[PDB]
Design a protein that fits this description.
transaminase, Aspartate Aminotransferase, domain 2, 2 domains, Aspartate Aminotransferase, domain 1, alpha/beta, pyridoxamine phosphate, transferase, seven-stranded mixed β-sheet, 16 helices, homodimer, aminotransferase, four-stranded mixed β-sheet
C-alpha cells in the first residue's frame, strides 16, 4: 500500500470533494524550508499562501522549533482551569495585551480561530445576561465574511459554501452586505457613497430587528477567504458610528490580518478600527502550533467576571486553552517578528508585490488587482466591461491556480480571484519569483482562453 | 511585576471564579516529570487527573518530545485542504482505522474534542440532508454528559454549569436521564431494571418527538467530567436496541475513555458498544499536542462523500486539522501505548486503586465509590442514609480537592465527588500514595465537618 493509497483509504479531507479525491488522490507535501515546500516527488513550490495565510516565519524557523523543545522538556502539557497557570501563557498574555492597538483587559486562549469566534459568541451572550439585557443577543456579520466553521462560527461566516447543506445559519446570526466595491457598488458610485449605503443598510437592519436585540457586529478588517476584499474608504469609520449609536460591540476578526499582514501590526490599525474584542490566530504562532487568542476590553471582562462570581465559576474552557507548548512557540514567534522588524519588512515587500502585479492591470482577463500590505488578490474575468466570468464563475481561478502549481507556486483560488499571502520573511528576489510565476500562469491561462479583441 | 501579578492582570481563566482569582491569584505550575508536576515554589504534586484526564504517558515522555522535534525539522506546518496531504496525518489515520473496535471507514481530524463533537453535529445534519431526510436532525444526549463547550457541543453537554448564563442548550438538543444508579434508581431497584427504565425513557422520548426527527444518540461509555458515572449493567445493550429500532446513529464519545482508560483500549469495548461514529482526543497524544479525531463508518462516509461532490467540496475544516506535529506526536504516543502494554498495565493499576479506595467504603462521609479500569471517583455526602450534601451540593468536594492539593495531590471535584484519572504509567506504590493522599484529605474533611 502506497502513501497516496493510504490517504485515499483512510482520510476524509477538509475542503475537498471526497469523490474527486478518491480518483485523483492527494498532493503529498513532504518537507518545508524557508518560503518553500516540497512534494514527495522532490518538486519545490513557493508557498505563496504561507500554507493557510499563516506561516509568517516560513517553514524552517529554528527558534520556534527550539522554543517548543525547551517547553516540552519543562512542562509539555498543563491547563489553566481552576486557578492553575503556567509561565508561557502568562508571558504571552502580557505581550498580547501590551501590544494591543486599543486598551485591552484580558486574554482568553483557544486552539483555533473557529473555537475563538464560537467562544466570543458565548462570551457576549454571557455578558449581556450578566448586565440584565437578556434580549441583547443577535450578531451581525457580512456576506462573504469568514469567521470559522463551528455550528455558531459558520453562522457568523457569510460564505454560502460553509452553510449550504449544514442547516446554517442558526437563528440570530444576521448578515449585511459584502463591502466589495468592484462587485456591489452601483454604476458610477464612489467608494465613500458605497460606504454610506452600507452604513444605512446596517442601521436599517438594526432598526428592523430592534436595536435592543443586537449585541455585536463582527468583521475581518479586510476579508481573507472571501477574496482579499479591501473595504471601501470610510467604511469602518461609518460602520463603527452606527454600532456605537446603538451600543453594539465591535469585534475585529484578525485571524488573517494579525501580526503584520496588512502593513501595520493589526488590521485594526490599518483600517482605523477601535474594537471591543479582537480574535487572533494563524500568524500568532506561524501555525507551528494550534493556538488562537481572544482579547477582551475592560467592560467585557468586568461583566463576565461578575457573573462568573455569582455562578461559582466561568463554565467554559478547552483542554488546550493556553497549552504551554503552543503559548511558548507563539511567544517566541512574536519576539522574532519584533526583533527582525518584520511588520516594516512585510510592508516594503507588499509594495513590491503589488507593483509587480500592476504590470498586468490592462490585461483583458484582469478585472481587479487588490490588497494592502503583504496580502493581495488578482480577480480574473472573461470580460472587463461586464465583469462576467469566462465560462462558469471559478473557471479562471481554478485554471490559474493549477498553472501556478505547475510553475512551482502554491496560490489559492477564491472563485476567480487568486490570492497572495506569502511568509513575512519573503525577500525581494522571492517576491519577484512569485510575480514571475503568476505571470507564467496568466500567460498559460490567456493562451487557453484566447481572448482575441 | 511578579508572575502571579501578571497572570491576574492579563488572563481570564477557564473554570474559575474571575473575582476570586483577582484576589488569590494562580497556582503556577513550573515543570513536570513522570506523574508529577511542581509549582513555582518547588512543591511536587501527584497529578492524579493526568492534567485533564489526558496525560497518558505522564509529563516527561522523551519519545513524544523527539517525535515532535523530528517532524518540526521536516515540515512544521501544513494542511489537508484541497487534496493536500502529508505523511503523519496519513499514517495516524491508518493506525486509528486499523485499531478501531468496529469497522470504520474514515478519519477526520480536529484540534479539540469540542470541535470534534461540533463537527459530528454538522456531519449528521449534512448526511441527512444528502439522504433526503431534512427533518432527521435532533440529537439525544444525557443529563451530566460532557461533550465539549462550543455553542453546539455545550448543547450536547448535559451539565448545568456549562449552560447556565450561556442561553443553552440550542433547540434540537434533547436530554434523557443520567444513568447513575446511586442517584436515580428507585428503592430496591436492580441495575438491570434501572437500565430497562432508562431504555423505556429513551424510546418514549423518540416517540414523543417523532422518530423521523431523531438523527443521533451520543454518549460517553462512562461519563467522565460529569462524575465518573458507570452505567448500570445492560444499559448500553438495551439503549442500542432502541437506537437501531428507529435508525438512530450511535455516537461513542471516547474523549476520556479512549486509549486504555477503562481496562480495554476503548470504552466501546468495555461496555459492548458498536458505534457508527467515535470521537477521540486527550490520551490520543497524551495532550502533548491539541489533536482530536472523528472515526466514521462506511454509511456515514458514503452519504457525506456524495454530498461533497454535489456541493463542490466539503465546506468544513480547521487550519489545524491533522497538523503534522500534532499527528506525528499522536502516532508515536499510540505506538508507545502498544509497545509498553499500557492497556494491561493500567488495568492492573486500576484494580489496586479501586481496592485501596474500597477500604473507605464504611466511612461516614463516603456515599459511593465508583469506577472501572483506571478511572474512579469517591462521592462524599453529609448523610449516608439520605444522601444529602453537607450545607449545599459541592461544599465537600471543594474542601476535599483543596486538602488533596495541600497533601501533594491534584484531583478534581465534580460536585461532591473527587476524581482519579492518573497517567497510565503510574506504578503500584504511586497508586498507594494517591490513596494515602486521598485518605489524609478525607480525614481533614471529616474533622472540618465535625461532630
Amino acid at each position: 500500500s502506497s502513501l497516496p493509497e493510504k490517504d485515499i483509504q483512510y482520510q476524509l479531507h477538509p475542503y475537498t470533494n471526497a469523490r474527486l479525491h478518491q480518483e485523483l488522490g492527494p498532493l503529498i507535501i513532504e518537507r518545508g524550508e524557508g518560503i518553500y515546500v516540497y512534494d514527495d516527488q522532490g518538486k519545490g513550490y513557493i508557498e505563496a499562501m504561507a500554507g493557510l495565510w499563516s506561516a509568517a516565519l516560513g517553514f524552517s524557523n529554528q527558534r520556534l522549533i527550539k522554543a517548543a523543545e525547551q517547553q516540552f522538556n519543562t512542562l509539555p502539557f498543563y491547563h489553566l482551569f481552576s486557578h492553575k497557570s503556567h509561565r508561557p501563557s502568562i508571558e504571552l498574555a502580557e505581550k498580547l495585551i501590551e501590544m494591543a492597538p486599543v486598551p485591552m483587559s484580558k486574554v482568553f486562549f483557544t486552539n483555533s480561530g473557529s473555537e475563538a469566534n464560537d467562544t466570543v459568541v458565548k462570551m457576549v451572550w454571557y455578558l449581556n445576561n450578566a448586565l440584565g439585557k437578556p434580549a441583547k443577543k443577535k450578531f451581525i456579520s457580512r456576506v462573504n465574511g469568514y469567521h470559522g466553521i463551528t455550528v455558531a462560527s459558520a453562522s457568523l461566516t457569510g460564505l454560502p459554501g460553509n452553510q449550504r447543506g449544514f442547516d446554517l445559519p442558526l437563528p440570530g446570526f444576521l448578515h449585511v452586505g459584502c463591502p466589495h466595491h468592484y462587485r456591489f457598488a452601483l454604476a458610477g458610485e464612489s467608494e465613500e457613497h458605497f460606504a454610506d449605503r452600507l452604513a444605512v443598510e446596517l442601521e436599517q437592519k438594526i432598526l428592523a430587528e430592534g436595536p435592543e436585540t443586537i449585541a455585536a457586529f463582527i468583521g475581518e478588517p479586510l476579508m481573507g477567504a472571501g477574496g482579499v476584499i479591501v473595504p471601501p474608504r470610510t467604511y469602518w469609520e461609518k460602520i463603527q458610528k452606527v454600532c456605537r449609536k446603538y451600543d453594539i460591540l465591535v469585534i475585529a476578526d484578525e485571524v488573517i490580518c494579525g501580526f503584520g499582514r496588512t502593513g501595520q501590526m493589526f488590521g485594526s490599525q490599518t483600517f482605523g478600527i477601535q474594537p471591543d474584542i479582537m480574535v487572533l490566530s494563524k500568524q500568532l504562532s506561524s501555525s507551528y502550533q494550534p493556538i488562537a487568542a481572544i482579547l477582551i476590553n475592560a467592560p467585557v471582562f468586568e461583566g463576565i467576571a461578575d457573573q462568573s462570581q455569582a455562578l461559582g465559576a466561568l463554565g467554559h474552557g478547552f483542554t488546550g486553552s493556553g497549552h504551554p507548548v503552543a503559548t511558548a512557540v507563539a511567544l517566541e514567534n512574536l519576539k522574532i517578528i519584533e526583533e527582525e522588524s518584520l511588520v516594516e519588512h512585510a510592508a516594503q515587500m507588499g509594495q513590491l508585490l503589488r507593483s509587480g502585479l500592476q504590470h498586468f492591470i490592462d490585461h483583458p482577463l484582469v478585472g481587479e488587482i487588490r490588497g494592502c500590505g503583504l496580502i493581495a488578490a488578482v480577480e480574473l474575468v472573461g470580460d472587463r466591461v461586464s465583469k462576467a466570468p469566462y465560462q462558469a464563475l471559478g473557471t479562471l481561478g481554478r485554471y490559474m491556480a493549477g498553472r501556478a502549481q505547475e510553475h512551482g507556486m502554491i496560490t489559492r483560488a477564491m472563485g476567480d480571484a487568486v490570492a497572495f499571502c506569502p511568509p513575512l520573511i519573503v525577500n525581494e528576489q522571492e517576491v519577484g519569483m512569485i510575480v514571475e510565476r503568476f505571470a507564467r500562469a496568466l500567460d498559460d491561462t490567456t493562451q487557453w482562453v484566447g481572448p482575441g479583441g
